Design a protein around this ligand. Structure first.
Ligand SMILES: [Ca+2]
Ligand SMILES: [Ca+2]
Lengths: 239, 239
């Protein structure tokens, strides 16, 4: 999987609305026939983010599958100038490239440092769709389910996940600390979501805790929950 | 009901631990035989708070019943100097007195201004005991239940509440916004609790919304949830 970070001179505009606009610009680069293909799965092979800085603005694009990477990676590198609505033509100052393959993930598993406590940071508005209406309070079952689904569909090409494992992961995980707040994401239907940081503990074998760490490490690329392609659900597993 | 606010020169000490210490000092003033009586109900006729300020420290004591007020009110007024463990002898600079009776509550009901949105501020660590273990994420059912129980036991002398009303109040209330964080209260067993602010909307008749406003206004005195007498569950309904 690939992680591309486009750096612009600091853009004075509400970050959440850039993410939606950047997503539109991104679609205008791909073959329209290929775009319609992306609209026919529960999970897209890409996730985007927008991080505002003190002196810069960063557009993050995650390539999550090899097939998607094969047809898109070169195109994204050619990008030097971006033009969005109501905004002056943007110039790409830098482009960073990081990669996350099986070698790094498997390394995470057999690590000498096995974590019991895990701190998740919700950089962008994160939401879940459960039992009809939306969700404003995150739960471990919803977090693990979204990641297990995203992982199963993208790298294993399997429609459904192991419910016993989801039960097992939820029974042994418990939120201990959090600092959260509401944050609505505009797609223009306002979508309810949350933002901030939480901490949970895992009680069990080191083989279990390793799977959690891997699932979270993978999550930093795919994003967590709803509308990850539009800029939602950007997470970060702190050291 | 009475609201006494004791003002000291700013005390350099963790506010949550003062609340526990002040509670001990408060018990050392009452008849030991009368103290044992307080330990024999699910709800105490008093609630305490500790609010840290920039230049002052405020000790709040709520008298919730007439009988408790009759035997305690005069004693609390005589207090000019307070001595707690590991602390220099404290001197009472001021003492403020406010009252909340049926006249103010009934006034709240027939108000010309009927609220749909309600913002609750959790000044001190608030916790609920539900289905065995504790609770870190507040819910409208837990909030209304605690207040309905506290109100029913204190002014109506009724052991249980109307479950249909609790169902009715929960079905029509919905959290829309919040800014919350974990905050453990030390009683020394660490008790998990939350802190901050939330906002919920009420969908229904004005008679329903008036009952909610009254219940919340009453809640500013009794406190919300667990261990209100020890300094927990101090709330504030903003204008
Ligand atoms: Ca990381
Ligand atoms: Ca008030």
């Amino acid at each position: 999987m690939k992680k591309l970070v486009f750096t612009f001179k600091r853009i004075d505009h509400p970050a959440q609305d850039l993410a939606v606009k950047f997503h539109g610009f991104l679609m205008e680069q791909l073959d329209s026939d290929y775009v319609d293909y992306l609209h026919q799965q529960q999970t897209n092979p890409y996730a985007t983010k927008v991080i505002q800085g003190k002196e810069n603005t960063q557009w993050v694009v995650h390539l999550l599958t090899d097939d998607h990477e094969d047809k898109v990676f070169m195109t994204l590198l050619q990008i030097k100038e971006v033009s969005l609505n109501d905004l002056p033509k943007l110039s790409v100052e830098k482009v960073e490239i990081q990669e996350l393959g099986a070698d790094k993930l498997l390394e995470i598993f057999n690590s000498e440092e096995n974590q019991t406590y895990f701190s998740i940071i919700f950089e962008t508005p994160t939401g879940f769709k459960s039992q009809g209406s939306y969700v404003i309070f995150p739960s471990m079952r919803l977090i693990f389910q979204s990641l297990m689904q995203k992982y199963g569909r993208l790298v294993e090409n399997q429609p459904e996940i192991e419910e016993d494992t989801l039960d097992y992961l939820s029974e042994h995980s418990t939120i201990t600390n959090y600092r959260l707040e509401t944050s609505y994401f505009r797609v223009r239907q306002r979508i309810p979501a949350f933002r901030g940081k939480l901490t949970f503990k895992v009680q069990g074998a080191k083989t279990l805790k390793a799977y959690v760490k891997m699932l979270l490490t993978f999550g930093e690329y795919s994003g967590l929950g709803m509308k990850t392609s539009l800029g939602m659900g950007g997470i970060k597993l702190e050291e």
